[PDB]
Amino acid sequence: NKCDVVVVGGGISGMAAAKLLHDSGLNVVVLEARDRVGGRTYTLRNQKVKYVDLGGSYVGPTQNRILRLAKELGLETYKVNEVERLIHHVKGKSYPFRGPFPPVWNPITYLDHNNFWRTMDDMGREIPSDAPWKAPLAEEWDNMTMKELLDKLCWTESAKQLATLFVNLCVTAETHEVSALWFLWYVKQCGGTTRIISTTNGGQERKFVGGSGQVSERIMDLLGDRVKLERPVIYIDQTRENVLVETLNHEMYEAKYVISAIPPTLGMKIHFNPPLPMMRNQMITRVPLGSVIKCIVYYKEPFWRKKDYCGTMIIDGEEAPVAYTLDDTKPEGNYAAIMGFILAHKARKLARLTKEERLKKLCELYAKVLGSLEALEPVHYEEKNWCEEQYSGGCYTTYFPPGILTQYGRVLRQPVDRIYFAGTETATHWSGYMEGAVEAGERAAREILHAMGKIPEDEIWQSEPESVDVPAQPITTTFLERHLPSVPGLLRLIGLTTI
Amino acid sequence: NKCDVVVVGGGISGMAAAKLLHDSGLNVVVLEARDRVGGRTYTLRNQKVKYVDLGGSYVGPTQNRILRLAKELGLETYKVNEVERLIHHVKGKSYPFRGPFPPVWNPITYLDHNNFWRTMDDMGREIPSDAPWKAPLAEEWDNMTMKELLDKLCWTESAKQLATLFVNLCVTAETHEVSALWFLWYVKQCGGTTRIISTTNGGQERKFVGGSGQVSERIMDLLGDRVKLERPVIYIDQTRENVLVETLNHEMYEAKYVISAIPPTLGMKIHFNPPLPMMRNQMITRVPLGSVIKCIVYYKEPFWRKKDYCGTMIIDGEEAPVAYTLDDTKPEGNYAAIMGFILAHKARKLARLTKEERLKKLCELYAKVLGSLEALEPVHYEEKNWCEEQYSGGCYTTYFPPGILTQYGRVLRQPVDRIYFAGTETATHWSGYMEGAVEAGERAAREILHAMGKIPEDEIWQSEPESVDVPAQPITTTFLERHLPSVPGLLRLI
Ligand SMILES: *[C]C1=C([C])[C]=C2C(=[C]1)N([C][C]([O])[C]([O])[C]([O])[C]OP([O])(=O)OP([O])(=O)O[C][C]1O[C](N3[C]=NC4=C3N=[C]N=C4[N])[C]([O])[C]1[O])C1=NC(=O)[N]C(=O)C1=N2/[C]=[C]/[C][N][C]1[C][C]C2=C1[C]=[C][C]=[C]2
Ligand SMILES: *[C]C1=C([C])[C]=C2C(=[C]1)N([C][C]([O])[C]([O])[C]([O])[C]OP([O])(=O)OP([O])(=O)O[C][C]1O[C](N3[C]=NC4=C3N=[C]N=C4[N])[C]([O])[C]1[O])C1=NC(=O)[N]C(=O)C1=N2/[C]=[C]/[C][N][C]1[C][C]C2=C1[C]=[C][C]=[C]2
Ligand SMILES: CCCCCCCCCCCC[N+](C)(C)CCCS(=O)(=O)O
Ligand SMILES: c1ccc2oc(-c3ncc[nH]3)cc2c1
Numbered sequence: 007n008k009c010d011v012v013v014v015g016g017g018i019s020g021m022a023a024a025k026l027l028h029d030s031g032l033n034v035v036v037l038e039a040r041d042r043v044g045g046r047t048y049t050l051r052n053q054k055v056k057y058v059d060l061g062g063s064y065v066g067p068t069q070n071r072i073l074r075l076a077k078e079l080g081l082e083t084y085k086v087n088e089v090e091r092l093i094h095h096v097k098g099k100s101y102p103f104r105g106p107f108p109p110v111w112n113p114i115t116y117l118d119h120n121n122f123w124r125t126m127d128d129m130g131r132e133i134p135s136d137a138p139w140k141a142p143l144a145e146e147w148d149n150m151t152m153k154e155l156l157d158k159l160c161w162t163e164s165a166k167q168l169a170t171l172f173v174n175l176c177v178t179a180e181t182h183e184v185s186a187l188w189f190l191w192y193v194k195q196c197g198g199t200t201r202i203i204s205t206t207n208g209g210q211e212r213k214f215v216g217g218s219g220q221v222s223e224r225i226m227d228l229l230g231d232r233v234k235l236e237r238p239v240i241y242i243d244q245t246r247e248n249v250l251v252e253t254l255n256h257e258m259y260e261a262k263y264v265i266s267a268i269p270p271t272l273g274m275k276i277h278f279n280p281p282l283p284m285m286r287n288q289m290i291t292r293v294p295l296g297s298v299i300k301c302i303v304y305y306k307e308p309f310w311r312k313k314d315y316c317g318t319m320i321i322d323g324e325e326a327p328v329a330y331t332l333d334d335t336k337p338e339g340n341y342a343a344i345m346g347f348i349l350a351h352k353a354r355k356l357a358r359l360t361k362e363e364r365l366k367k368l369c370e371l372y373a374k375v376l377g378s379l380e381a382l383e384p385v386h387y388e389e390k391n392w393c394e395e396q397y398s399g400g401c402y403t404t405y406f407p408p409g410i411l412t413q414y415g416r417v418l419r420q421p422v423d424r425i426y427f428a429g430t431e432t433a434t435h436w437s438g439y440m441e442g443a444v445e446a447g448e449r450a451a452r453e454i455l456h457a458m459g460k461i462p463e464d465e466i467w468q469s470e471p472e473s474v475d476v477p478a479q480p481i482t483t484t485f486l487e488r489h490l491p492s493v494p495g496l497l498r499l500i501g502l503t504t505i
Numbered sequence: 506n507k508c509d510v511v512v513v514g515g516g517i518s519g520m521a522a523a524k525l526l527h528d529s530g531l532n533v534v535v536l537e538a539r540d541r542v543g544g545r546t547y548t549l550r551n552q553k554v555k556y557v558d559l560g561g562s563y564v565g566p567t568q569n570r571i572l573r574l575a576k577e578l579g580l581e582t583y584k585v586n587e588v589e590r591l592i593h594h595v596k597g598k599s600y601p602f603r604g605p606f607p608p609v610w611n612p613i614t615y616l617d618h619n620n621f622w623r624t625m626d627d628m629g630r631e632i633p634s635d636a637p638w639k640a641p642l643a644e645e646w647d648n649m650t651m652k653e654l655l656d657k658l659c660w661t662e663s664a665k666q667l668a669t670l671f672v673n674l675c676v677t678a679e680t681h682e683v684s685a686l687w688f689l690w691y692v693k694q695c696g697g698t699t700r701i702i703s704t705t706n707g708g709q710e711r712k713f714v715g716g717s718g719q720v721s722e723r724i725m726d727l728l729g730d731r732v733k734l735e736r737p738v739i740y741i742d743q744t745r746e747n748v749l750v751e752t753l754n755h756e757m758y759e760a761k762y763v764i765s766a767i768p769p770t771l772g773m774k775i776h777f778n779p780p781l782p783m784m785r786n787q788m789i790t791r792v793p794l795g796s797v798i799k800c801i802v803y804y805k806e807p808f809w810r811k812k813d814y815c816g817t818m819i820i821d822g823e824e825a826p827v828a829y830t831l832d833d834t835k836p837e838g839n840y841a842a843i844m845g846f847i848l849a850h851k852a853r854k855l856a857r858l859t860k861e862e863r864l865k866k867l868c869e870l871y872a873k874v875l876g877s878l879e880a881l882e883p884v885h886y887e888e889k890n891w892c893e894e895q896y897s898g899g900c901y902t903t904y905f906p907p908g909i910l911t912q913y914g915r916v917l918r919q920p921v922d923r924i925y926f927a928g929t930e931t932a933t934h935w936s937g938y939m940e941g942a943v944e945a946g947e948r949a950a951r952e953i954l955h956a957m958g959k960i961p962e963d964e965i966w967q968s969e970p971e972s973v974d975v976p977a978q979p980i981t982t983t984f985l986e987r988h989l990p991s992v993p994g995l996l997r998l999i
């Protein structure tokens with residue numbers, strides 16, 4: 007089977023690459039391991055739920071590429087519910103609030119909290135989005151975990167605990183598992199702490215009507231039979247004039263170039279000839295994905311709205327199986343549902359239970375957090391544990407442990423002869439997200455267009471017009487937020503005065 | 506085609522497993538990815554070196570299983586040269602010394618150094634060899650890197666620089682890359698700090714005459730055509746009556762049981778049907794191997810001996826490519842040579858250079874440390890960079906980043922239906938060494954004999970009698986080693 011480009015992987019990244027290549031007149035083939043396209047996006051359809059996203063789902067302002075792609079495919083978005091109050095549940099009690107952060111009243115504690123978020127963003131501006139290893143203190147920040155950085159920065163337990171929950175929620179890993187340099191890069195390349203955490207004006211603002219899985223499905227429709235399902239790639243041979251790509255079900259494909267659009271560590275599932283160079287060879291053993299179970303509990307009505315709760319809950323505590331939820335009710339107001347994430351070590355701990363026992367524990371938690379016995383009367387339940395996926399490795403994305411990003415980072419998207427690398431991990435804006443997948447898939451496709459002499463070099467990286475449907479408000483601070491001292495800053499001032 | 510047990514991997518561990526099963530009367534096939542056996546051991550032969558070990562090489566007292574296996578195969582050991590003085594090279598100067606640790610003269614520094622070694626051994630006494638996630642402080646120690654532990658414990662830069670070299674040399678990874686729990690288990694399961702670092706009476710005491718690659722080659726000689734080279738395994742299907750194992754060159758093997766005798770992460774190279782359970786599926790993406798180039802510079806004579814140096818050098822500082830060396834001269838006094846390890850980030854850094862550029866750097870360093878122009882005149886050079894090996898992933902062994910050993914560690918040896926797990930990573934004594942490979946391969950082999958009803962449960966794990974050729978002497982401490990206070994302890998008395 008002969009073509010111009012073989013794309014390995016039919017998730018969003020590979021489908022976007024294939025689409026770009028196909029629209030340019032090339033012959034592409036997509037080799038997908040599963041019986042479906044979409045990868046870490048998956049939309050379940052049945053009569054009880056109508057449709058529901060079990061993997062990637064949320065899109066928001068500044069994610070202009072996935073928005074343009076989805077629009078061009080005939081899809082619409084709608085807004086996640088944030089009309090009523092959010093809830094911060096901490097030490098067994100719920101405190102309703104509005105805004106990006108639960109209010110903090112103790113003035114010392116307020117100083118510590120304000121300095122925490124501020125400093126994450128301050129450190130982040132030192133870090134180039136396209137080369138995090140070029141930060142001036144890249145080595146010092148990469149040689150520490152997030153846990154060590156939090157221990158040094160937070161002068162109250164309250165700030166340390168909120169921060170810990172933010173890390174677990176952002177990257178589905180524990181603070182002691184991840185590099186400080188990598189996590190700080192990861193937040194900055196999504197636009198910063200406010201953009202990444204928020205619903206209104208942030209990452210979680212919207213969902214696609216009908217599910218995100220339609221993105222990959224509609225591209226598959228346009229490509230017709232160029233997409234080969236149940237073709238896991240086992241072997242890539244670059245020793246001859248054309249590249250040979252072999253599949254597990256005994257098929258051979260021959261091409262000029264290959265795009266690898268799979269998570270970096272799943273490159274281990276492929277035997278290479280000749281062997282990868284040393285740096286990539288080791289890099290793909292060093293970059294695990296996080297751990298998460300996405301759970302959706304359905305109810306007769308969205309009862310929390312009547313208590314003036316929008317359904318967003320930040321839930322702190324070792325005993326809480328779920329640390330964050332959002333209202334997952336359909337835009338029409340039916341199929342009332344709460345979506346929650348079970349994160350990092352709790353995904354591993356609670357996977358031992360049955361589905362019915364996990365549903366029990368979530369309802370009892372929601373009943374307590376919402377102060378509502380109706381939470382004990384679910385009508386349906388769907389869930390997916392991504393830790394068990396042979397062809398994903400986890401979700402949402404790949405994290406870097408201490409020391410890895412500075413030593414091996416520069417190789418993530420470095421071509422290996424005629425293999426180019428897409429996949430959301432190799433993006434520079436919303437890496438980890440469906441937005442990053444589109445950016446990486448189209449950039450890798452244009453690297454190949456450039457190698458064939460079809461476009462000039464300055465067209466490999468291409469900026470994206472802002473969505474007219476999902477405008478981005480800028481992220482602003484107040485004068486007090488900018489200039490209030492940190493806790494040790496204030497202690498320093500007290501020392502000074504006392505002389 | 507059809508057999509009783511397929512062994513995936515022909516390193517020491519897979520070979521030891523296959524030999525045990527074959528000696529029991531079972532039909533075994535070994536499927537090996539490479540065009541050779543040995544894996545992380547590799548013995549090169551040519552007229553210039555005669556033979557040289559480019560991977561695993563050293564054996565010593567308490568490693569009784571690899572000693573017994575080798576002896577049975579007709580191999581012999583000889584002693585690594587440690588007659589003359591060792592060298593510590595620090596801030597551009599050489600300090601010769603005798604005994605296990607370089608002397609320290611500043612009294613505060615002496616207290617700090619003594620406390621560091623003693624504390625590593627005290628912590629390890631609380632970590633079970635067969636279950637390190639059961640240490641009373643497993644989570645606390647697992648959630649910190651060795652770098653954090655060293656920042657807490659070491660009150661002097663001198664103790665911290667030496668501890669840092671110790672970690673790099675021991676596990677070919679940076680102190681900030683590795684779990685404190687995991688590292689402290691690793692040293693304790695080799696018999697502690699003195700046992701692991703010593704030449705005389707420790708893990709570097711001896712080498713095999715003719716090279717360690719002969720262990721695997723000689724088992725392959727026994728097994729004949731049961732061993733298949735250039736058979737990378739790609740697919741294992743357990744959904745039927747018999748297990749089906751497929752290779753890259755399109756052959757199909759069928760067995761009642763499988764032994765996986767490869768580094769855990771190389772498990773990623775195989776597609777599984779049904780999918781692996783969740784905890785193993787993620788575990789095998791979380792366990793990289795270290796980074797090392799092993800380099801051997803040959804000379805006309807072992808000239809360091811005329812200066813009363815043994816050729817063992819401990820070399821501190823960023824600028825030194827090699828932090829540790831041993832005399833690699835043959836027992837006969839000929840093929841004079843110095844072996845050095847380029848460790849961790851330096852392996853990655855110096856890999857960009859050419860072979861000749863690395864040779865020149867090593868020779869200029871050894872000239873400075875040994876104080877001899879003769880080091881500038883090498884007659885030959887051999888080296889191997891293990892980071893580049895598709896079917897090893899690095900060397901010496903698999904390290905655990907912070908958080909991983911407690912969450913996933915119990916999954917390493919757990920059977921997956923009819924697949925049993927060997928490989929030095931699953932051993933409980935000298936895991937990470939050739940000794941651990943033998944332990945783990947023989948244990949996995951006997952779990953299958955037990956699954957078949959051939960032996961009882963209490964025969965899965967078997968003790969090994971002590972080698973008469975390489976007996977162990979006790980590790981001792983002095984009264985002052987045991988009771989001198991630490992730096993904060995001396996301070997508390999003030
Ligand atoms: C899983 C998940 C979840 C659960 C969730 C989420 C997610 C996920 N996300 C992420 C996404 O999804 C991603 O990024 C994407 O999807 C990616 O794409 P790509 O790159 O394409 O990749 P994939 O998909 O994986 O694909 C691949 C393919 O390939 C294949 N393979 C493999 N291997 C192989 C193959 N083939 C052949 N051969 C071989 N060998 C496979 O199968 C596939 O298909 C996200 N995203 C977004 O955007 N959104 C969302 O939502 C999401 N998610 C989450 C979120 C969260 N959020 C939260 C809330 C609150 C907060 C947060 C964060 C932060 C802060 C705050
Ligand atoms: C590399 C190396 C070096 C450089 C060095 C050293 C070493 C290494 N070591 C280690 C040893 O060698 C080990 O442990 C062993 O060998 C292991 O075994 P096993 O377990 O068996 O594994 P391997 O080998 O890898 O095997 C595997 C096999 O398989 C195969 N594959 C894969 N994949 C696959 C396959 N097949 C089929 N299919 C598939 N898919 C491969 O190919 C192979 O073959 C060591 N050891 C000992 O014992 N000794 C020595 O010497 C060694 N080394 C090191 C040492 C050092 N020392 C130092 C000095 C001073 C000091 C130290 C340390 C500490 C302290 C002080
Ligand atoms: C007589 C006066 C003695 C008071 C001296 C106070 C000692 C300070 C210990 C507080 C530790 C606070 N955390 C946040 C844990 C670490 C800060 C890291 S950093 O110090 O800013 O580098
Ligand atoms: C720490 C961890 C999770 C969090 O989610 C929010 C949030 N969600 C919607 C507006 N703010 C804020 C926040 C802070």
Ligand SMILES: c1ccc2oc(-c3ncc[nH]3)cc2c1
Nearest residue numbers: 605606670671702703704819
């Ligand atoms: C730190 C790093 C490497 C080291 O090697 C020794 C040594 N080798 C032979 C006897 N002691 C001691 C030592 C301490």
